Structure formats: structure tokens, C-alpha cells
Amino acid sequence: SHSLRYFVTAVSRPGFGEPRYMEVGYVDNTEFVRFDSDAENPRYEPRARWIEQEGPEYWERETRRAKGNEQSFRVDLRTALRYYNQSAGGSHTLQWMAGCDVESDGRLLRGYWQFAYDGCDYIALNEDLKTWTAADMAAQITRRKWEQAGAAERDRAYLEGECVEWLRRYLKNGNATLLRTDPPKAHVTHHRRPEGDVTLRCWALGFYPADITLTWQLNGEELTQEMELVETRPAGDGTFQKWASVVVPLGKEQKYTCHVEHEGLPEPLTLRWG
Amino acid sequence: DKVYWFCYGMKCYYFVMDRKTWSGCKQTCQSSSLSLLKIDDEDELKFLQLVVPSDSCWVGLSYDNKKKDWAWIDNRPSKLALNTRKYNIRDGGCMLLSKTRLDNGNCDQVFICICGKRLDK
Amino acid sequence: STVLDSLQHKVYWFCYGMKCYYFVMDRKTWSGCKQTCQSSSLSLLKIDDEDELKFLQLVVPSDSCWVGLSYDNKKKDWAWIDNRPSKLALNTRKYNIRDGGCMLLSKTRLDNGNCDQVFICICGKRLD
Amino acid sequence: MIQKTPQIQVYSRHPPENGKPNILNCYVTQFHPPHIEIQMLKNGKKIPKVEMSDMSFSKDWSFYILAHTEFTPTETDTYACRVKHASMAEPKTVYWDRDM
Amino acid sequence: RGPGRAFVTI
């Protein structure tokens, strides 16, 4: 499955300037375009090398779309203050994410066209791509407005057509790097703790994509017995990192083996303290 | 942990207002003789979305990397029709419930838990 | 029947900490709400602290709900349902009584409204 | 409306070894509102040259950001990341641990 | 290419 998605943010700062507005496009979690209102003459900019082959028309068109979108959000931020009876003094955040997830076949697996206000769901186009689910009565006002205007049809047209068409185009533009798989450079560290036992930590560095499965086994078994791990984390260069550890009795380290699973590994890895 | 709970029909729901990993939530629920929430049908989904505390919440549905498919906590089906292909492991292998959406997220990230208990068992 | 209905005769509810809340969906006047809660041996909600207010706004309707806080004309000030103070630091002077002498709770506000208007009632029950 | 506290992780790009230049990373996630102040510290002193990824948020709406700067691990120098966010009364500091 | 709000405000 592959995806083309745009993440948009509008943050107000009443009395101190126009709302900060941002748009970020991603193809399978890879950022390729971004528009930041914070510049003298803001425009959409390339973020991946494979999007630089898009001609000038494309960039001026998207820049115009982004500015048009920025205007709607300024109005939205004002409307939200009235819907929620809030004062014009505080900063508020309005977010939007729209895009498509398309199966290997070219069929639309799932479409997105949803919003959030101050950190939580506000409204979302349902999977039927026809009706909406509102988070509260304020958002219900929006829903009634959009259903009566039939705004969903316009959104669905984009999700099933243009979004899908361009995702396919992008996947060709970036064939070389959008499907890259950097295998993990794995090693095991041994730490003796005050408790008397030992912490065996299995490390995985410089891999890509972020997806990965690190597991520990005892004499080749279901060592799911509570192991410690951390959230997969990024590096400046775009690769990821992760580790998983378990406590073991000092003297029986060679009994435990770490197994690393990753898309870039034709065959899973098995490491020992050795 | 602070707990926001109630019972409706033949099930009780407990929202553990502390953000934990999906695994943390599963452990928290069975430690109190409950189970990370299983949604049984569309009507229960819509009802729960109305009372969710304005946040994304861990429920008992997750990806099994060895079976290469999603399965509820009890390893049995639900009348809640779900096309598991609509969730790419690329966005995570654990499911979250919010007021307007049901979407997968990163199992290692932290969110509040929804523990469930059936009264008619 | 509802959770508040007697055995022999619409309300949503939940508990949080040492307290339970019942939302009487049949909109009523402020005093109408006061009475309804009293009839069920409950009390029009008194918010005890900032934390309770914080949590409640995560789950209460965007539409307002009557709470147990009102203006006493012959004391020229606001008082909770039990006529006792609350840990909640509320500025009961930033409200213009010309716009209402009863307190409403909403997802984003604690705004005053006209006591004669009808809104959902939030009834509170203290555990033990 | 809801505010979410930032989750913080401090780690190095490469396995550490004293005297060998490396890259110190501070990954902050799951926070809201987006307004945030991040400071990487060396012996409690603000490291000057700090770069951070551009504003980004996940499907759940919460924000995340990666801050990084050059550093050379020694045996007694300390490295930390201090984060100031509206969701916390006080700044939260997380120290680097060469073993995690 | 991205989505357009096309002035369909909340």
C-alpha cells in the first residue's frame, strides 16, 4: 500500500500577526513538499530530490492553492472562536490532513479529509466518503453546513482521482529512493546492574524504513516475558534507531539471543553477547 | 491512575487517564481483571465516540507480525466489519479510538486506555 | 427507565474519582434543574477544583449545561449550591449579571446565562 | 481543548566513545500545542548551534520534532535536553545516558 | 498535488 497525504496547520496569535500557516506533503511518510507562511514571499518548496523535476507551473499552482487554503483557515480560526465562545486573546490551533492510501492494484484503500481544533478531533469525512462524523455540537454546525452544501462530493473527487493519479506519478518520480531499505547495523551491549544481574540491550542503528521487530529469546523460545524497549527514533540523516533489553542472571548470557527483523534484511539476524 | 468510567447495557467501560504504550494498557487492564476494549459492532463504535474524552485511546485491536493480520484481544471476530487492509503497518500496529475516527497508531507511543468488562459473561 | 428513574414510575452518567455525574437531557430552567437533582437525592453540580473542571471539559457537551452556581441578589455575589466556598479560583466579577444570574458549563466555558432558559442539567453525587 | 505533555528521548547518532566527535539527538513527541522551547545542554550550559526539524505532526494531531547538534562525549561531561511546554508547570530535563 | 479548501469553511 502507498500514500500521498498533506498535513496542514494554522496557529493564531491575535494582536501579534496573521496566523502561522504550514502545509507538508508526504508520500509514504517521506516529506517532499512544504509551504511555510513565514517568509516575505512564501511559496511551496521541494523537500525531496525527486520532486525537483516538477516544472515551474506546478510550483506556482501549488503555491496559489496553499495561499487560497491559508485564507480559508484564517476565517476558520475566527469562526471557531464564536462557535466556542472564546476570547480573541488566546492562541488556537486548527489542523487538517487529507490524502489517499492506494493498494498495489491502484484501488483506493482509504481516503482522509479530517480536522482538529486545539489538539483534538473536530470533524472527519467518513470512509463512505459521503458523510461526516463531528466531535461535538459546534462541529455539528459545520457538518450540517457541509452536508447541505454537499462538500463531500468535491472532497471525494480529489481523493479518488487527483490524489490517486499523482501518488502514482510521485512513485515513479522517486522510484530510486522511496522504496529504499537500509538494513539495521545491530550489536549487543552488556550492562551489569546493582541488583546483581545483567541488562542485555539489543541495538539496531541506521536502518530505513522505521518499521522493525526486535525480540529476545531464551534458549530459542518465546521470551516475550516482559522485555524493555524504546520508541523507534530518528537521526539527522533520516535513518532510524531502536533497542530492546531484558535482565538476565550473571553467568548465563549466552543463553539469550536477539532476533532482528527488517524489510532490508533478506534473512533475520540473530545476535548473542558473544 | 485517575479513572473515568461507567456501564451502559451489558458492558462497563474504564478510561485509564494515564498515557501508556499499547502493551502498558493491555497489562493495566488484565491486572484489574478487565481486557483492553473490544468493540463489538457499529452501534457501539458510534456510542463510544460520543463519550471518548477528547483524545486518542488504545483499544484491544492490534497487528500480529507473524500472522500478518489484525486481531482483537480475545483472538475472536467482531460484528464490527473492518477491512484490515485499510491500515498499513507503516502507521503503526495498534488501534486508536478518537471522537471522530478509528485509526492505527504507533504501539510504542503513549495514549490513555479503554478497558472493558462484559456483565453478561 | 433511566439510571435515575425509580424502580416503579433521558440521562447519561459516569463516575470520576470520588464522584459521579448525571446529565439530565430534558432541558430545564436553572431552578428546574436544582429541583430535579434534589428529587433524585443528588445535587446540581458543584465544581470543587481546577482539576475536576479540566477533566469535565474533555467530556461535557459543546452545548452548555446548568451547574450549581448562581447569583444571590441580596448578597450581591455568586454562591455554589451548598452556599460553601470552592477550591476553584473563579473570578465571579468578570460576569455581567445583566446577561444572566445562573452559571452554565460548556466544553470551553463557564459562562453565565439567564436562569429562565432551559439547558441540560448536570447532577453530582459524592461517593462516601 | 487538550494539552499533551512532550515525550523526550536523548541519544547519540553513533555508538559513543570518549573523545570521538558524534551527534547528540533530542527527539520530542506527542505534544500539543505546537508552541515549544527546546534547549540542548552541555554541563547545564546551552549548546549554541542547535538545529531542529521543521514543524510536523502525526495522524493523531500531536507534534514531534528532532533537535540535534555536534558533541564529543567524555567521561565526566553531561549532556541533556531541556524542554519548556505549556503542558508542564516547569521545564522538563532529560539527561543523556551512553547506555540508552 | 494537494487538496484545496476552495473556500468551504467550517
Q: Is C122 exposed, middle or buried (0-12, 13-18, 19+ CB in 10 A)?
A: buried
Q: Tell me the one-letter amino acid at A89.
A: G
Q: What SS3 class is residue A63?
A: helix
DSSP letter, residue A159: I
Of A22, A121, A205, nearest to D55 by CB-CB distance is A22
Q: How far D17 CA sits from the closest chain A CA (Å)?
A: 13
Q: Which three cell numbers stand for residue A243?
A: 533497542
Mutate to test the interface with C, among A79, A81, A84, A93 (most CBs of C within 10 A): A84
Q: Which three cell numbers stand for residue A183?
A: 538494513
Within 10 A of A149 (CB to CB), how many other CB atoms are there? 11
Q: What SS3 class is residue B89?
A: helix
Task: Write down the number of H helices and E strands in chain D.
Answer: 0, 9
**Dist CA A53 CA A166 (whole Å):** 14
Q: Which three cell numbers stand for residue C99?
A: 446577561
CATH number of the CATH domain containing D31: 2.60.40.10
Please say whether the beta carbons of A142 and E10 come within 8 A. yes
Burial state string for A184-210 with b = 16 or more CB within 10 A and e = fewer than 16:
bebebbeeeeeeeebbbbbbbbbbbbb
What is the number of domains present in chain D? Answer: 1
Where do the structural domains in chain C lie, given as residue ranges?
1-128
State which residue of chain A sits closest to B100, comparing Cα positions. A133
Rounded to 5°, the CA angle C17-C20-C25 comes to 145
**Dist CA B20 CA B110 (whole Å):** 4
Q: Which CATH superfamily is domain A181-271 in?
A: Immunoglobulins (2.60.40.10)
**Could you tell me which of A193, A182, A194, A180 has the C-alpha nearest to residue A239?**
A182
**Experimental technique for the deposited model:** X-ray
> Which long-range contacts does A146-149 make (Cβ < 8 Å, 24+ apart)?
A146/E8, A149/E8
Q: What SS3 class is residue A191?
A: strand
Backbone angles phi, psi at B52, to 5 degrees: -60, 135
| Cβ–Cβ contact B18 with C under 8 A | no
Task: Collect all residues of chain B within an 8 Å Cβ-Cβ radius of residue D7.
Answer: 109-110
Q: Which CATH architecture fits C1-128?
A: Roll (3.10)
* CB within 8 Å of chain B, chain A residues 98-127: 101, 103, 109-110, 114, 119-124, 127
**Cα-trace Rg, chain A:** 24
**Dist CA D36 CA D48 (whole Å):** 17
Enter the CATH code of domain A1-180.
3.30.500.10
Of A65, A73, A76, nearest to E4 by CB-CB distance is A65
Q: Tell me the one-letter amino acid at A162.
A: E
Q: Tell me the one-letter amino acid at A105.
A: D
Of A65, A80, A155, nearest to E2 by CB-CB distance is A65
Residue A228, beta-bridge partner list: A245
Please say whether the beta carbons of A13 and A91 come within 8 A. yes
Within 10 A of B46 (CB to CB), how many other CB atoms are there? 10
Please say whether the beta carbons of A202 and A271 come within 8 A. yes
Q: What SS3 class is residue C17?
A: coil
Q: What SS3 class is residue D93?
A: strand
Q: Is A160 exposed, middle or buried (0-12, 13-18, 19+ CB in 10 A)?
A: middle
**DSSP track, D39-76:** EEEETTEE-S--EEPPPEE-TTS-EEEEEEEEE---SS
Locus of grid cell 477528547: B54
**Dist CA B22 CA B41 (whole Å):** 22
* CB within 8 Å of chain D, chain A residues 11-50: 11, 22, 24, 31, 34, 36
Q: How far B32 CA sits from the closest chain A CA (Å)?
A: 18
* CB within 8 Å of chain A, chain D residues 37-66: 51, 53-57, 59, 61-62, 66
Q: What SS3 class is residue D34?
A: coil
**Could you tell me which of C19, C113, C111, C23 has the C-alpha nearest to residue C61?**
C23
Q: How far D60 CA sits from the closest chain B CA (Å)?
A: 7
DSSP letter, residue D96: -
Which helix (H) or strand (E) covers residue B70, if one does?
strand B69-72
Within 10 A of B10 (CB to CB), how many other CB atoms are there? 10
Q: Which three cell numbers stand for residue B25?
A: 494498557
Out of 3.20.20.10, 3.10.100.10, 3.40.30.10, 2.40.30.20, the CATH code matching B1-121 is 3.10.100.10
Please list, in sequence order, all residues whose beta carbon lies within 8 angstroms of the beta carbon of residue C22, skipping any fewer than 6 positions away: C3, C4, C11, C12, C13, C37, C40, C42, C122, C123, C124, C125
Where do the structural domains in chain A lie, given as residue ranges?
1-180, 181-271
**Could you tell me which of C100, C98, C87, C81 has the C-alpha nearest to residue C51?**
C87
Please say whether the beta carbons of C127 and C113 come within 8 A. no
Structural domain that includes position D51: 1-100
Backbone angles phi, psi at A20, to 5 degrees: -80, 130
